[PDB]
């Protein structure tokens, strides 16, 4: 990994309290699963590598980066305390794309397709038991 990309978001921290919830289980088993296999997932499956993409201003603009590879690791190595934290990561990922890129750009259309799917699934986020 290039020194000119930031370190990725935190995925492991023993000091942060962790909990499994049914909602977090749904986020992994249903939401992440659904979005990961989408035809348009690939740009979002890992941190933006601004060096390889020749976007030297990316991390000048995007100060709260997030991606589904990070979210997958956070879900699989349960990082979260609640589903809101994970939903916020997805929302951050989409908003980064919409802030950095022009409306109607391919990457935006791809993000918008994943977000539509995401919204459908989050509307069915089960009641916390
Ligand atoms: O917004 C972003 C993230 C990203 C992922 C993939 C490609 Br190609 C371009 C970009 N720019």
From Swiss-Prot:
Misc remark: JQ1, a thieno-triazolo-1,4-diazepine derivative, and I-BET, a benzodiazepine derivative, have been tested on tumors with success. Treatment with GSK1210151A (I-BET151, a I-BET derivative) has strong effets on mixed lineage leukemia and promotes myeloid differentiation and leukemia stem-cell depletion.
Entry's disease: Cornelia de Lange syndrome 6: A form of Cornelia de Lange syndrome, a clinically heterogeneous developmental disorder associated with malformations affecting multiple systems. It is characterized by facial dysmorphisms, abnormal hands and feet, growth delay, cognitive retardation, hirsutism, gastroesophageal dysfunction and cardiac, ophthalmologic and genitourinary anomalies. CDLS6 inheritance is autosomal dominant.
Organism expressing this protein natively: Homo sapiens
Protein name from the UniProt record: Bromodomain-containing protein 4
Localization in the cell: Nucleus; Chromosome
General function of this protein: Chromatin reader protein that recognizes and binds acetylated histones and plays a key role in transmission of epigenetic memory across cell divisions and transcription regulation. Remains associated with acetylated chromatin throughout the entire cell cycle and provides epigenetic memory for postmitotic G1 gene transcription by preserving acetylated chromatin status and maintaining high-order chromatin structure. During interphase, plays a key role in regulating the transcription of signal-inducible genes by associating with the P-TEFb complex and recruiting it to promoters.
Transmembrane segments annotated in the record for this chain: none
Lineage start: Eukaryota, Metazoa, Chordata, Craniata, Vertebrata
Recorded domain comment: The NET domain mediates interaction with a number of chromatin proteins involved in transcription regulation (NSD3, JMJD6, CHD4, GLTSCR1 and ATAD5).
Subunit and partners: Interacts with p53/TP53; the interaction is direct. Interacts (via CTD region) with CDK9 and CCNT1, acting as an associated component of P-TEFb complex. Interacts with RELA (when acetylated at 'Lys-310'). Interacts (via NET domain) with NSD3, CHD4, BICRA and ATAD5. The interaction with BICRA bridges BRD4 to the GBAF complex. Interacts (via NET domain) with JMJD6 (via JmjC and N-terminal domains); the interaction is stronger in presence of ssRNA and recruits JMJD6 on distal enhancers. Interacts with NSD3. Interacts with NIPBL. (Microbial infection) Interacts with bovine papillomavirus type 1 regulatory protein E2. This interactions may serve for the tethering of viral genomes to host mitotic chromosomes allowing successful partitioning of the viral genome during cell division.
Recorded family membership: Belongs to the BET family.
The record's account of how the chain is modified after translation: Phosphorylation by CK2 disrupt the intramolecular binding between the bromo domain 2 and the NPS region and promotes binding between the NPS and the BID regions, leading to activate the protein and promote binding to acetylated histones. In absence of phosphorylation, BRD4 does not localize to p53/TP53 target gene promoters, phosphorylation promoting recruitment to p53/TP53 target promoters.
Covalent link Glycyl lysine isopeptide (Lys-Gly) (interchain with G-Cter in SUMO2), residues: 60
Disulfides per UniProt: none
Residues covered by the Bromo domain: 19-125
Gene: BRD4
Tissue specificity field: Ubiquitously expressed.
Residues at the site labelled Acetylated histone binding: 101
């Amino acid at each position: 990994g290039s020194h000119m990309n930031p370190p990725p978001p935190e995925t492991s921290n023993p000091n942060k309290p962790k909990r499994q919830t049914n909602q977090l289980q749904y986020l992994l088993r249903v939401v992440l699963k659904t979005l990961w296999k989408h035809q348009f997932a690939w740009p979002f499956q890992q941190p933006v590598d601004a060096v390889k993409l020749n976007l030297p201003d990316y991390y000048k603009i995007i100060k709260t980066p997030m991606d589904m590879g990070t979210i997958k690791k956070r879900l699989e190595n349960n990082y979260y305390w609640n589903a809101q934290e994970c939903i916020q990561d997805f929302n951050t990922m989409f908003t980064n794309c919409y802030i950095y890129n022009k409306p109607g750009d391919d990457i935006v259309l791809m993000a918008e397709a994943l977000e539509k799917l995401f919204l459908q699934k989050i509307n069915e986020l089960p009641t916390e038991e």
